[PDB]
Amino acid sequence: LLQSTFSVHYLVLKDMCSSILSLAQSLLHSLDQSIISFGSLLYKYAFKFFDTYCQQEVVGALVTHICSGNEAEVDTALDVLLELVVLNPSAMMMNAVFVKGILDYLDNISPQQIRKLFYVLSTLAFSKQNEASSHIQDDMHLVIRKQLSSTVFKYKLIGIIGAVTMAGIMAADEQCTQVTSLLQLVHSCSEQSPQASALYYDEFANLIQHEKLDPKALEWVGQTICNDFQDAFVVDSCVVPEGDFPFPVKALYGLEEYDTQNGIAINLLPLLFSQDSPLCLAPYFRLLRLCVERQHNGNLEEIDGLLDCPIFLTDLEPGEKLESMSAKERSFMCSLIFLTLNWFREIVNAFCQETSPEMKGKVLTRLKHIVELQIILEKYLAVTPDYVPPLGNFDVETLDITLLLHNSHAFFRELDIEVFSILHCGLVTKFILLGPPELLFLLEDLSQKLESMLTFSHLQQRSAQEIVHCVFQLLTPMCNHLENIHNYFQCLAAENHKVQEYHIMSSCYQRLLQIFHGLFAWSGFSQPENQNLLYSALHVLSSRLKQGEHSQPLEELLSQSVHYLQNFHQSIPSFQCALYLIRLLMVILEKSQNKEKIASLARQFLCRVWPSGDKEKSNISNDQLHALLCIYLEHTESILKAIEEIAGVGVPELINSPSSTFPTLTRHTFVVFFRVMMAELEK
Amino acid sequence: MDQKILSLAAEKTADKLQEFLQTLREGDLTNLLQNQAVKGKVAGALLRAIFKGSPCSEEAGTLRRRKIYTCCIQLVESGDLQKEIVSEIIGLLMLEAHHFPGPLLVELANEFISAVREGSLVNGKSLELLPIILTVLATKKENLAYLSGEECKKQLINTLCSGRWDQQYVIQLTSMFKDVPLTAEEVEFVVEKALSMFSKMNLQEIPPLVYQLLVLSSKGSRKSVLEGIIAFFSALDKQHNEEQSPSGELRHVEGTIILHIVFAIKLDYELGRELVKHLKVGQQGDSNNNLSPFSIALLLSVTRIQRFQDQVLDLLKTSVVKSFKDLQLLQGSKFLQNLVPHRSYVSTMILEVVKNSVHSWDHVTQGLVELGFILMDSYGPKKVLPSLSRMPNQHACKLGANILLETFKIHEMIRQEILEQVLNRVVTRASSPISHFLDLLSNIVMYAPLVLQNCSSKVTEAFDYLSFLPLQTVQR
DNA sequence: AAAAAAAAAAAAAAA
DNA sequence: TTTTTTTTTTTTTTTT
């Protein structure tokens, strides 16, 4: 409406510019982001349609928003400024002095906005049609140079981010001398804090992976990066190095198809003992990975030795005999296992996209190494809970700074999306005859990624649309096989009636259904562009029974898909996974008489046994039962008659067992059953 | 000669570079001179090599560091280099200047002060090193004696601000002080020396100095900067009035100091409260000499900041009625005429603002129009449908019409904003007395119907409302 | 004996 | 300037 309003009637509106800008400013001070979006559009169109005085008033208004500001208003103003430098940089150049003046007021601004701010300022700066007013280059260089040259890490991060952002925008031979001199300055100021050099490596890596830019500085730097890495950590494979260590130092976790009496091995324990440079291992490998992917176009022919090289570590046997010692050596072990896990995660991030099958076997051995180190590290955290090895992700967690659930997503290096190319492979079973925890790990990651995105540094620079677009390939026709193999496992597990296998596979099932629920509850399907993707997606869910019925109507595909999906309700081991199945069926059946299937399936889950393990009945906790009975009582056609069914079976609890002819009915469950009963009676 | 320094710097530190440093003892000046003659990247390479070859735990290398500091500090100004080597030198010195004791940084800062007193800083790009050094004195917790290093920072700042500054390095000396963590007293010293330096400069190098003062104000001292710029430009306005007994220089300078104070009030809503508190007339009754044609143009421009609009217009309204009360009191009595020497009144100052605004001050004139109609709307008759309710209200309401009639004549764009608002008060009110608006509309028309045939349709749209008016309003 | 769930009271924000 | 409603926190009671 606002687009049509301005684009048609911008001669009626012209003479009343200032009142519009007095309006727009009030619709940026509010909460309720649809209002803020409206205000943003008013500033965009006031800039776009009006004459050269009102453009200047618009830019002045946005600069006042940024500088004076509070968080969301600052973000919105920086978003509008990015649109205004993209749209018409000629009329934005005449208002360069306002935007240059933002640099005197950078204490209010937080570093997620500082990346955007230097993006705006550099995008204004590096147009060759206004080299004569290069004053903003000088002022940007000054504020970079004053930040970079400071002991305080809170300023040094500003300097690093602004510096590499200037560098990245000025990379589309004198210009290359400028970029290399700037980057050498950043390197020199970073070298002497470790986490500062880490943030340099991290942010430079993000700059590579997001913007590919003219690869002249990249091939310039990468010939130094490979050499610096191969003398910084790469040692000849000698078993025991120098130094006095109260720990047997070996070359552990080598893949052993590699010859042992060879070259490349990676030094960890003499590095971290010398600290008390090893903390930058993973981001520096990420940078190396990205520059060689830019050079050899995905080929890592000189870095395949990094995949299988042993690691110079102590004996990482579970030290239960090494108790009564929680001294600094305990933190040494915990930090060591943490650093090698981050290293390993960077390896599996590195070699996941490669298609060579023996290399895929190497990657899978790396994944099983990861899960063994994770269970060892959680054992070491069960030794001492207080000894945090604090190494957050550098974008957001470090400025917050400057048990297993927090460090699972905040501390470790973040897996990439292409790491889920691994689960093309099919499971193998150790008990019945890619292991079950090696699938649990990937699915436990993917569920967290989907809930974070649809309801996390490298992820969120991808749009939600491309995320669900790549999920459509990299989940559904790949995870359907894992679902069917899981169904086949649980059929044999039902026929037979060790425990850790089934216990892991239950959580694997739960995560598969949770991913399915998070996928099919995507609100972007409500918008009229994405239903063709549904005409893909449930079509594949339709294709698991029979093919040949191509170009079908929508509700036919829905009926075929739910008819495929229903049958899993016999193989469901637990309660929460059942809840996820029925909620998935709910949210896919809302696209279309339907209530009969949901009511029957809820009744099937209510009359199912759900056996009497103590933690198993603990997974039939109150809120999950509450949600399930809300679904059942709402989705029955005869609500009061269903209440007579439940109260008719609500009386024989006391007469049989002090446990009913209708299970999930104890004395304890009747609080939940009663509350949902009279609650739905009220509704 | 440099290649052996690079080859010793390649593998390890402080084991061969120090030993080569005790071979060649002198002649690093001409080395770096021929180095900038050939290539500046090689000079940065040698600077990194020397700085890693000369640690600050040992005391032999610190003297080489000091000598190369003085060498680069002199060559960054005196030596006409290319810009990139200048940036690399200043970046390298600013980076490596952390690792020191107290007195070496203290004598570096003393060299800076002694240079900026007398020594011809050929450009003055070395000054960027100066705040970094003082910042390290903020964090140097190694004890000195003469004191704490922060007290040495206080004394060096006091020695810098108390001593003479050169005319060409007052913008750069203020821009430097933006990055030193200062307390209230240091920033008051800096603004006091800088405000002292206004009379000895080009007028066109006063707006950017005001800009650096306004961004540097935000730390402690807002009242001092506002009082200083209002006082200095009020004095200049008065001297220009006596010389009439530069103007496109003085008006285009005040027409850019005024925007700086307005923008700094937008980004900072306490600079505006300091301006309103510092200029308010109604302290108890007495009219202050802080109001002038400059300081009133600044109030009228701050009325387009929407938070200050009612507050500043009400301030100028009470500041006009007080002036007329004072003038009536003096004119009625000779005893007061003997004592009090003849003061300019707010009426004459406002009518000077309207004359001044002709050039480029369009920012002012939309606030002149609002003051005009606030004076007329608030002080027009009602008692016919006495001296105190009548004569300082008759005189304000006729100041209003004078503001709007003189503003109408010269500002060719707020015709149809006066003329459709005069008419809109004549037509629609018609119950309350509106003789003053018919007087003003008669003046506006009679003055130039030649300038009203370019804004005429605002008249012929009030012809359609002529039926519903009372008869005397139609005749009038 | 400890942990989890649910309710009630207090604070804060919007009309 | 005043009142209501929602959200968060804390306590108490029940269960494992």
UniProtKB/TrEMBL annotation, chain B:
Domain of life: Eukaryota
Residue ranges constituting the FANCI solenoid domain according to the UniProt record: 64-266, 364-476
Domain FANCI helical positions: 270-356
GO biological process, one term: DNA repair
Domain FANCI solenoid 1 cap: 1-53
The protein's name in its UniProt record: Fanconi anemia, complementation group I
Organism: Homo sapiens
Gene name of the encoded protein: FANCI
